[PDB]
Amino acid sequence: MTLNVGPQHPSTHGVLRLMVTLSGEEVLEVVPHIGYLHTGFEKTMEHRTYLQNITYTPRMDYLHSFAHDLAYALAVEKLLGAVVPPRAETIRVILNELSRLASHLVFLGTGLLDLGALTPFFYAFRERETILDLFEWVTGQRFHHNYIRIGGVKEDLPEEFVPELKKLLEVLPHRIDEYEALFAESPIFYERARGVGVIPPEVAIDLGLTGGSLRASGVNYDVRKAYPYSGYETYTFDVPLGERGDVFDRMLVRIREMRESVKIIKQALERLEPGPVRDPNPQITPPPRHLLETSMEAVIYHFKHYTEGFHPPKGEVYVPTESARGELGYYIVSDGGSMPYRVKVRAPSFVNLQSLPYACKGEQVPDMVAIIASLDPVMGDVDR
Amino acid sequence: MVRVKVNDRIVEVPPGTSVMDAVFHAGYDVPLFCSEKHLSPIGACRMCLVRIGLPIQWQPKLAASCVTAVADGMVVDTLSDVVREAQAGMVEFTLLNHPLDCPTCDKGGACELQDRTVEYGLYEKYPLELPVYTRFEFTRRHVDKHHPLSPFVILDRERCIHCKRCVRYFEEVPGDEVLDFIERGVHTFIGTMDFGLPSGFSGNITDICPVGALLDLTARFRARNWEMEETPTTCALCPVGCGITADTRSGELLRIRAREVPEVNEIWICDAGRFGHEWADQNRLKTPLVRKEGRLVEATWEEAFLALKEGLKEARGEEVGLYLAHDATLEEGLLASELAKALKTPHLDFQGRTAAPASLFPPASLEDLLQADFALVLGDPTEEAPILHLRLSEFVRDLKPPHRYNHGTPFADLQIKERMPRRTDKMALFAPYRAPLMKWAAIHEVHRPGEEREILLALLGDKEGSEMVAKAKEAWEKAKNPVLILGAGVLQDTVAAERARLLAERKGAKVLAMTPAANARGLEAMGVLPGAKGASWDEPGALYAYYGFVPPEEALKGKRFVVMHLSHLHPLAERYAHVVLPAPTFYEKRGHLVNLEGRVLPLSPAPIENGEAEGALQVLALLAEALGVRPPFRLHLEAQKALKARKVPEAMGRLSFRLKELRPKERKGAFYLRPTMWKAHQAVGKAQEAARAELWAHPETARAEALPEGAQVAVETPFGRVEARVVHREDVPKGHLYLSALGPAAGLRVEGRVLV
Amino acid sequence: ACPAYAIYVEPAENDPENPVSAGERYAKVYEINMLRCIFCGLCEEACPTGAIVLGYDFEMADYEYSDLVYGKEDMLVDVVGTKPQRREAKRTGKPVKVGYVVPYVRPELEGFKAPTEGGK
Amino acid sequence: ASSERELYEAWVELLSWMREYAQAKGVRFEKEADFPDFIYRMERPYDLPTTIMTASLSDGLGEPFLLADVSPRHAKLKRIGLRLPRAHIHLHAHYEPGKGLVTGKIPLTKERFFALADRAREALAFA
Amino acid sequence: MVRVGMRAAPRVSLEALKAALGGLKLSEAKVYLITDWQDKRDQARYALLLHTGKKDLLVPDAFGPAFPGGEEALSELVGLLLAQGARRFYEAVVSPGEMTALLDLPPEELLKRVMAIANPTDPGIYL
Amino acid sequence: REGILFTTLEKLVAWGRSNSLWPATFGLACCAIEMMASTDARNDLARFGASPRQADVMIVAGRLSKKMAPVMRRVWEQMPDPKWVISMGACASSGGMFNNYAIVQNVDSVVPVDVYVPGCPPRPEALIYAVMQLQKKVRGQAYNERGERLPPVAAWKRTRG
Amino acid sequence: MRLERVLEEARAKGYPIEDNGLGNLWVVLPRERFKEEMAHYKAMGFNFLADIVGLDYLTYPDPRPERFAVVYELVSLPGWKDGDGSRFFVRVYVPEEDPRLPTVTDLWGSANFLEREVYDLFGIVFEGHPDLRKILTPEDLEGHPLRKDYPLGETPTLFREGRYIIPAEFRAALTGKDPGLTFYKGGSRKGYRSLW
Ligand code: SF4
Ligand code: SF4
Ligand code: SF4
Ligand code: SF4
Ligand code: SF4
Ligand code: FES
């Protein structure tokens, strides 16, 4: 029976196509087939200003978008040698981690539904709604928020964001525990997930499975730790880990990651005092809007910046970052033009997938669904 | 070559080099306002300032790299902290009094100020200090704004940075000081007491201005610089075929600009070329018409092909006339030629065909006219072949083609000094009136129509000319390598043309032949001229005809079947024509032309709104079906195969083609048609008044025919009836009437009358 | 500024007698293809006069593609509604109620009237 | 001081006078420029009595014979000036409180201005 | 690549196309309909490029309701592609200005541009 | 019989359908996750089927890749007949911000669109507006800007084939 | 420490070394030594194969040795047996008229999909691969999309009355080989970098 699990049906999530080579109730090998979401950013973006690209960055991993935003912003800033303000950096860690909580909330919502049953999608959705309301409050958008800038960030935080982040930072510890309460003591799930989904660290390394589905099999590698960037270097930081990589452990690890993320939120929230928000170098940052009515240089630079944009030095650059899906980063070749010569995006979700024909090899069929949800893909990242 | 080192790199570079050019030649850069390609550098805006060494021995004060000569083994510094600081400084001085118009400015995306400011400006002082754009916190210079200088040109005195580029240009290149600065200090400004902006070259200053002070009124407030689809093409309005750029956005022609092509036109266009674009996107015919009930009806291409099969069903193949446009593509000329080979016919011709083929004479290159020892001129360069005026302005000042750098043409040519002295002894000019250029012609003479032939005879030496013509003879004698320039009167009269051909053959001397037809020499070269029987473009000879222009009414009158392929709709056709069809302008065409210098030029198509228009290639191909013949060409590419087989060179290649045959025609002197720059089909919009017809007569004979100084007189020519303001001129020969030949009908002598 | 190239502006010259904007220049056409539009607000952010500023309406779902390319006169501060909303409210004659409320409107939107909070 | 405000009000005043001389003689007046600090003022507040920075009187040919301007709301050493094109003629109006609008120590009345404008038209104006 | 037909003349073009296809089986061919303007099919014009895979064929913009009796011609065109077993229909959107220039380009270039821009489409909309 | 030909009966069934409008979601990109919000608030809709067979309304939510088009084609064809198509977001409706080789520049190419819903992503409540549209559209209560009343089902208008 | 042992090895064998002061480091091996040297690289202790990034330099303002160039990213995981944290790029240039290159599939199974992508988007064929099938671009897509000679494939954005925009004719932004809209570009617009 080479069973053909289709592109979008039946609930093989996110438009993947799977040729499950399978006789009986097991799984021989799944021959994965992708490419159904291929939008072609790496080409499109060669045709957009470095500013213009910041609208295309959130759009690939749309769950943890700000990791895209962060990675790209950073690689460019590096390449043009820009200096990001501390409060902007702090906000960027807050947003990154908040967007992470959003993404994770989604991952376990879908996971619990995928095999097993319906109810807990909703509570995760409630907390996610409080997070999305936070994002709307600060960026005016739910996601794909055009906020981060090569200098820094688009504008400052409104009065109302701080109070609301606390509210969710208050319920979440009790809240994350409630999700945990159901799961860690897994009723059926234990006899459903504990055995399934085999991950040898050596093959994870051989096939290159980086993304936090790696630490669930007992390899300790986090980009916020191993290659620190935005001042994660300076936080009280716990990295959850798994024993032997199954479905269950992956699944709980990310839940621990949620309270630790919340602890980073609280921690960063503590260290935040008033100041400016983006690198004032006019080559890098469009002028203050108020003096467009006074200065010649202002107007010239405004016009120029928003039409042509800016030209970074000839050079190639890359910086690594941590998403809720793993190693993410932008490989930016600039030719000294207003638009990048080329942007190849290192897609965590793309390399992470070489280990599914491995992962679900010999597993069950009902489980072959669960074992997919447990690997947490996002296809925008994959196809791309 | 002189050995120079700029920053980290070394360059070979010829001795008279501008330091600026040696800079850019090394692949570096430096702010540039006052200096301009083909203009005298004068360290004026003082932007180009760099450092120079001469042994490590640095000079005390900075060299303007634009006005500094280069010396052997010289060093040039452009990136030093102190240099960049100084550059930023001059930029700040320039920005000091400026208006604040970028969003609302037509100079939009491409402003030498905007770009230089964003390149070199705000030097890095030493952290995330909060810095200031602007130091000066006082009131700016405020003057007159948005002031029309001419129907074609608008002036903002606030934007002007007082580089010298426009005034400099006016004195040096066209030679009409219709522009200069007024007061002094910071109060200085551009104005004119010659109000019209008289020169027919006035619009180039719009291109030159590093800022938006001088802008192009015909294209004011249309789209922003980036927003246009820009179609590089060549201008088919006359035989010199300047490079242009046809800006169109959403199907309509916004703006024509100069395309630099140093071999022929340099960085310059003529006013008629550039502002005379009003009509091409304006009022034009978008469907085929047929005659049904004594009148015309809008029809399918199909129904008109039925009509076309029908009208030619009864027709024998030698009764058909084949007639093309003065601007017809080499592909169109060639396919028409091959189809009339196939379909045996004695009469095919083109609109500006001259009694004597421009092929009689060896084509001369422009730079040949730079190198020549003498220039003998008969005809008017300004009106017949307009930018020739400007190359003769180079010729006269002894200028010669520059050494070619890595950034190409030099930015500050050390060779052009400001306010240059002009030789009057290098050329002799003979025109039917006192020509504009007669200023620079020591040997110069106002003759009358059809008198060319006798000057030319005098030059051959078969008789004795006036004081002037003997001086001219003698100077062309002593001329070691002269060029002979010949107009309509020369080329439109067999004998004159032959004497030219003769004189210019005897002394090995090339010719620049100004045809009333643009693609004349190439269309000749594709073999489109009348045959034995000989109905010519203006002759009512054929029984059935195809016409790519609008003929004398005396030609149409009589014919059995007539089919016209136009762009706009003519009144002369709805009373005489059986089938009309849409054609693209040259702006929107694709195909080749041959220069009066023998060079082949590309027409790319502009995304103008053609409607359902089609190139003549397709039309001819389709007209051959109703007649039985299957055509060799259909499309542009196959046309390229057959052209290439026909051995027409690569574009920018010269095509060598001589010819020894004349078709003479008597010329009936009552009225002369003054060859004019402005073309008849161009009088729309602001080109409305400028392309007006004129009738010139000597005030005495004017008085005799009762013709007052301001009057719009009705005139009839065999070429149709035209109204013309009446201008009195004392350099015009008595007893003649010059009527503006706003077509390629120029230089013809005709019967006619001033109707009342 | 537009990454989706969704904004078409045909420009124009102010009439001295009866002016439109504060310069010598104003916008003869302003079209935005909502279907092309990605909603960055890079347009607003690029805008020098604080002319173009994204609003509050979301009830713009409509049946026809070309009904979705909004013009200037559908976007001015005085207008209350989206296209299908307003069109329903005319074909009904029952006034528009937007399905939203805000604590207040931004300083940049000044003049834009909305249902707010308990400010009303 | 708040002399600034009375200055802008007086500037409006001078503009009014220009408009009048314009209609009177059947010779063109032109509003040349508005305030960047109004145009490019976005949400930012604007209290000034008009939004107009630069104006002129042009002849038949549109070449101005008289020019007049006031400082932007935000500039140091605020003045209102007059200039006669081509004639090298520059005048500086201040405002002394209680007295009125003055050029240095000399009062600038409407009349003085009308005379200056007529001399201007008759001399300088081409048509 | 071959080029047949002429711009804006529906019935002649249809008759010629019918002539040129023959007994060719189209099961592995790809059919590209080149048009300007996504939304309005009512005033649309259509050109067609057929990539058979063993050779290519161009028709200019002679099809659609834009020209008289043109709609019935486009409809019968698509019907006829469908009968020979053509399945894969694509829609390509060009600027009106492009349409003339596009078909005057050399075969290879025009074909790569067309395959790059073309959108998979239901054959039914042209019926 | 398609819901038609008694003034009482057709209106009755037409409400039946409009209020019953049974979305069959066809998720693509981020737009699909923006419809998973819509699932929460919902109240004629959000029971699925999910299986195409069982549903009238097809919701195209996300960028539709060119390689993905023939698939969505059959899913639409493999729906029962009285069926409607909602097009969600810029990528679907027009080509969106990705104007290129990869993506269908209007989904209306492959499936007959009933209702379009702009935004990137559109707020969920806009999609409610669109299903109220389509609700009230199949009631035959819907008009365009030209003055015309709109048909209950588009794809009662394409030629199948 | 494992990185030092790589650079020290490359200097002796005449392998050129690229460095930007941003903290990114390359090592370019010739085609010959590539397969074996990199085998030695996994053998050198390199756990993880991060990337295969294909580059088409056709439109890059300066020339490079060959048109296409591929970069592999080799690492040794820091939380493993004895992980340095040593990560680095290995670049290999590839001829235009010869899109060959050995897979490291034997070595890393990471090499499996990534090398396939680089095959799909650029014409580059990877030797010894278990399966080189087209990955991303539509089945019937002809050619290789992300290489510069291949059209981005834009469609006009559409407005009301005959009004269109052609993005590529609308673009304000300039590329590296773009002149700009004045006579030339100098300064910041020929490339800029702030100094920290
Ligand atoms: S001249 Fe140049 S700098 Fe001045 S307003 Fe115009 S575009 Fe701006
Ligand atoms: S008007 Fe323009 S070209 Fe003439 S001097 Fe002023 S800035 Fe130079
Ligand atoms: S000189 Fe002749 S070819 Fe040049 S722009 Fe003028 S009319 Fe055209
Ligand atoms: S929000 Fe503005 S800049 Fe962004 S896509 Fe829409 S119109 Fe363009
Ligand atoms: S319209 Fe925006 S939110 Fe929807 S799929 Fe496209 S990028 Fe994602
Ligand atoms: S001083 Fe003007 S460029 Fe040399």
C-beta atoms of E115 and G142 within 8 A:
yes
DSSP string, B687-715: HHHHT-EEEEE-HHHHHHTT--TT-EEEE
Asked if A302 and A292 count as a contact pair (C-beta separation under 8 A), the reply is yes
Give residue B74's domain range. Answer: 1-219
C-alpha distances out from residue G104 to G39, G107, G108, G109, Å? 7, 5, 6, 8
| Separation between Cα atoms, residue B317 and residue B319, nearest integer Å | 6
Cα pseudo-dihedral B273, B277, B279, B284, rounded to 10: 110
Cα pseudo-dihedral D22, D24, D27, D33, rounded to 10: 10
| Separation between Cα atoms, residue E10 and residue D118, nearest integer Å | 72
Q: What phi and psi values does residue A98 have, to the nearest 5 degrees?
A: -65, -35
Q: Domain segments of chain D: what residues?
A: 1-127
DSSP string, G124-168: PEEET-S-----SS-TT--S-TTSTTS------EE-SSS-EE-HH
Count interface pairs A-B at CB distance under 8 A: 51
What is residue B628's DSSP assignment? Answer: S
- Which of ligand 2's atoms lies nearest the C-alpha of B190? 1
Give residue A164's domain range. Answer: 1-384
Task: Give me the count of residues in chain F.
Answer: 161
Segments of B43-104 assigned E as strands: 49-53, 63-64, 74-77
From the CB of residue G64, how many other CB atoms can be counted at a distance below 10 Å?
12
The approach used to solve this structure was: X-ray
Q: What phi and psi values does residue C32 have, to the nearest 5 degrees?
A: -135, 125
Q: Domain segments of chain E: what residues?
A: 1-127
What is residue A54's DSSP assignment? Answer: G
Give the closest residue to B33 by CA, choosing from B86, B87, B101: B87
Give the closest residue to F17 by CA, choosing from F48, F55, F50: F55
Instruction: Say whether both B2 and B107 belong to one domain.
Output: yes
Asked if B472 and B428 count as a contact pair (C-beta separation under 8 A), the reply is yes
CATH of domain C1-120: 3.30.70.3270
| Separation between Cα atoms, residue B56 and residue B45, nearest integer Å | 29
Give the closest residue to A262 by CA, choosing from A169, A161, A123, A165: A169
- Secondary structure of residue A211 in the 3-state scheme: coil
Peptide bond into A287 cis (omega under 30): no
| Separation between Cα atoms, residue D69 and residue D119, nearest integer Å | 19
From the CB of residue E19, how many other CB atoms can be counted at a distance below 10 Å?
9
B159 pocket-lining for ligand 1 (C-beta < 6 Å) = yes
Q: How far is ligand 3, taken at its centre, from the CA of residue B130, in Å? A: 53
Asked if B284 and B568 count as a contact pair (C-beta separation under 8 A), the reply is yes
Q: Which residues, at least 6 apart from F105, have a Cβ–Cβ distance to it below 8 Å?
A: E38, E93, E119, F94, F95, F99, G155
| Separation between Cα atoms, residue A384 and residue B93, nearest integer Å | 50
Asked if F157 and C92 count as a contact pair (C-beta separation under 8 A), the reply is no
At B365, list the tokens.
Answer: 């290159």
C-beta atoms of C65 and F137 within 8 A:
no
Number of domain units in chain A? 1
| Separation between Cα atoms, residue B299 and residue B305, nearest integer Å | 10
| Separation between Cα atoms, residue B230 and residue B246, nearest integer Å | 6
Amino acid (one-letter) located at B619:
V
Which residue is closest in CA terms to ligand 2's atom 8?
B163
| Separation between Cα atoms, residue B385 and residue C39, nearest integer Å | 54
Q: What phi and psi values does residue G103 have, to the nearest 5 degrees?
A: -80, 155
C-beta atoms of B98 and A279 within 8 A:
no
Q: For domain E1-127, which CATH number applies: 3.40.50.620, 3.40.50.970, 3.40.1530.10, 1.10.3720.10?
A: 3.40.1530.10
CA angle B8, B10, B15 (to 5 degrees): 135
Q: Is F31 marked within a binding site?
A: yes
Asked if B76 and B23 count as a contact pair (C-beta separation under 8 A), the reply is yes
| Separation between Cα atoms, residue B597 and residue B522, nearest integer Å | 10
Asked if A289 and C46 count as a contact pair (C-beta separation under 8 A), the reply is no
Q: What is the resolution of this structure in A?
A: 3.3
C-alpha distances out from residue B687 to B151, B275, B738, G4, Å? 8, 7, 21, 75
H or E element in which residue B500 lies: helix B494-506
Number of domain units in chain B? 2
| Separation between Cα atoms, residue B42 and residue B102, nearest integer Å | 28
Distance from CA of G9 to the nearest CA of A (A): 24
C-beta atoms of B110 and G182 within 8 A:
yes
Asked if A170 and A143 count as a contact pair (C-beta separation under 8 A), the reply is no
Q: How far is ligand 3, taken at its centre, from the CA of residue B365, in Å? A: 17
- Secondary structure of residue A157 in the 3-state scheme: coil
| Separation between Cα atoms, residue F83 and residue E125, nearest integer Å | 17
- Chain D residues within an 8 Å CB radius of C48: 40, 42
Q: Domain segments of chain C: what residues?
A: 1-120
Secondary-structure breakdown of chain F: helix, strand, coil percentages, each rounded to the nearest 5? 35, 15, 50
- Chain A residues within an 8 Å CB radius of D40: 292-293, 299
DSSP string, D24-77: HHT--EEEEEE-HHHHS--SS----S--EEEEEEE-TTS-EEEEEEE--TT-SS
Q: In the block, which residue shows the tokens 């809008």?
A: B298
Q: Which residue out of D38, D40, D42, D46 would a mutagenesis test of the A interface target, given it has the greatest number of A Cβ atoms within 10 Å?
A: D40
Could you give the residue ranges of the DSSP H alpha helices within F58-160? 69-77, 90-93, 124-138
Asked if B655 and B594 count as a contact pair (C-beta separation under 8 A), the reply is yes
Could you give the residue ranges of the DSSP H alpha helices within chain F? 7-20, 30-35, 69-77, 90-93, 124-138
| Separation between Cα atoms, residue A324 and residue D14, nearest integer Å | 68
| Separation between Cα atoms, residue G21 and residue G1, nearest integer Å | 20
Q: Any idea what the CATH number is for the domain that residue A299 is in? A: 1.10.645.10
Which residue is closest in CA terms to ligand 2's atom 4?
B166
Q: Which residue out of G137, G139, G140 would a mutagenesis test of the E interface target, given it has the greatest number of E Cβ atoms within 10 Å?
A: G140
CA angle A161, A162, A168 (to 5 degrees): 90
Asked if F104 and F110 count as a contact pair (C-beta separation under 8 A), the reply is yes
Between A161-184 and A247-270, two packed helices, what is the crossing angle to 10 degrees?
A: 160
Asked if F83 and F155 count as a contact pair (C-beta separation under 8 A), the reply is yes
C-beta atoms of A146 and C41 within 8 A:
yes
Q: Domain segments of chain G: what residues?
A: 1-196
Residues 131 through 190 of chain G touching chain C, CB cutoff 8 Å: 157-160, 163, 165, 167, 170
| Separation between Cα atoms, residue B280 and residue B288, nearest integer Å | 18
| Separation between Cα atoms, residue G145 and residue A342, nearest integer Å | 13
C-alpha distances out from residue F84 to B407, B604, F66, F81, Å? 62, 47, 22, 9
For the domain made up of D1-127, give the CATH fold: Metal Transport, Frataxin; Chain A (3.30.920)
At B207, list the tokens.
Answer: 């291109």
Of E38, E98, E117, the CB nearest to G158: E38
Q: What phi and psi values does residue B674 have, to the nearest 5 degrees?
A: -55, 120
Q: How far is ligand 6, taken at its centre, from the CA of residue B60, in Å? A: 19
C-beta atoms of E38 and C65 within 8 A:
yes
Q: How far is ligand 2, taken at its centre, from the CA of residue B270, in Å? A: 19
Residues 86 through 145 of chain A touching chain G, CB cutoff 8 Å: none
